[PDB]
Amino acid sequence: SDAIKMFVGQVPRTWSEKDLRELFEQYGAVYEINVLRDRSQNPPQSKGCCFVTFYTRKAALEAQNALHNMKVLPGMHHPIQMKPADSEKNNAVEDRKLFIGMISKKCTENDIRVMFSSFGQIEECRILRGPDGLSRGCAFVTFTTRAMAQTAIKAMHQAQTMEGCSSPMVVKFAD
RNA sequence: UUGUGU
């Protein structure tokens, strides 16, 4: 597929970008290798892990299949660990997720799904409940895109008061 | 008790 940056652990600290490029080019073309470094003191030192960006996802998977938990590099006591880099993270759930406050305690997960469905696809909806199963009068709602979330907010924040509630419904991005 | 995933 298209380009992707992988994070790789259990790389010997003595390996440089050049040793790494040779290892990963066995599985697919490599756009870039970047050894994570520690510069707290002299000299700079490898942190025993690197980023490799492959041109294609197919390459990245082929390398993963061949290496992850599979190959133990010279002097290591655990095999290579490889996964997409944190910087590759896209729709972090935490930025499509809404806190819904001041809902009726009789509100069901399905009631909320219904209330917010007209704004997009809801991937998850959960009512916070105490130990006795009683609603805490609030929920979490995750849309597939942040843009849906933002649309729900504009239209639903404080737009009405629900039964037993002392103030209008609260709709905002979750903490 | 405006409650943010035990």
Strand A135-143: give its sheet, edge to edge: A122-129, A135-143, A97-101, A170-173
Nearest-CA neighbor of A68 among A9, A127, A146? A9
Q: Which domain holds residue A132?
A: 90-175
The CA distance from A135 to A132, in Å, is: 9
Q: Is the CB of A167 under 7 A from strand B?
A: yes
CB atoms closer than 10 angstroms to residue A142:
19
What are the residue ranges of helices labelled H in A25-96?
A: 57-67
Listed as ranges, the nucleotides of chain B within 7 A of a protein C-beta are: 1-6
The CA distance from A131 to A66, in Å, is: 47
The CA distance from A107 to A110, in Å, is: 8
A163 with A94, same domain: the answer is yes
The gap between A102 CA and B4 C1' (Å) is: 12
Tokens standing for residue A63: 């390398």
DSSP state of A28: S
**Last residue of one domain, picked from the residues A89, A124, A140:** A89
Please classify residue A40 by burial: count the beta carbons closer than 10 Å to its beta carbon, then call 0-12 exposed, 13-18 middle and 19+ buried: exposed
Q: Is the CB of A55 under 7 A from strand B?
A: no
Give every CB contact of residue A6 below 8 A, 6+ residues apart in sequence: A51, A52, A53, A54, A60, A63, A64, A82, A83, A84, A85
Indicate the pairing of strand A97-101 with strand A170-173: antiparallel
Nearest protein residue to B5's C1' (by CA)? A128
Task: Kindly compute the dihedral angle of the four CA atoms of residues A159, A164, A165, A168, in this order, to the nearest 10 degrees.
Answer: 10
DSSP state of A44: P
Long-range contact set of residues A42-45: C-beta below 8 Å, sequence gap at least 24: A45/A13
Cβ atoms A138, A100 nearer than 8 A: yes
CATH code (residue A144): 3.30.70.330
Strand A30-38: give its sheet, edge to edge: A30-38, A45-54, A4-9, A81-84
Long-range contact set of residues A65-74: C-beta below 8 Å, sequence gap at least 24: A66/A26, A66/A27, A67/A27, A72/A10, A73/A10, A73/A11, A73/A12, A73/A15, A74/A12
Q: What are the beta bridge partners of residue A7?
A: A51, A83
Q: Any idea which nucleotide's C1' is nearest the CA of A170? A: B2
**Last residue of one domain, picked from the residues A45, A63, A89:** A89
Solved by what technique?
X-ray
Q: By three-state DSSP, how is residue A19 classified?
A: helix
**What b/e readout covers A60-94, taking b as 16+ CB neighbours within 10 angstroms?**
bbebbeebbeeeebeeeeeebebeeeeeeeeeeee
The CA distance from A6 to A146, in Å, is: 25
The CA distance from A144 to A146, in Å, is: 7
A129 with A50, same domain: the answer is no
Total domain count for chain A?
2
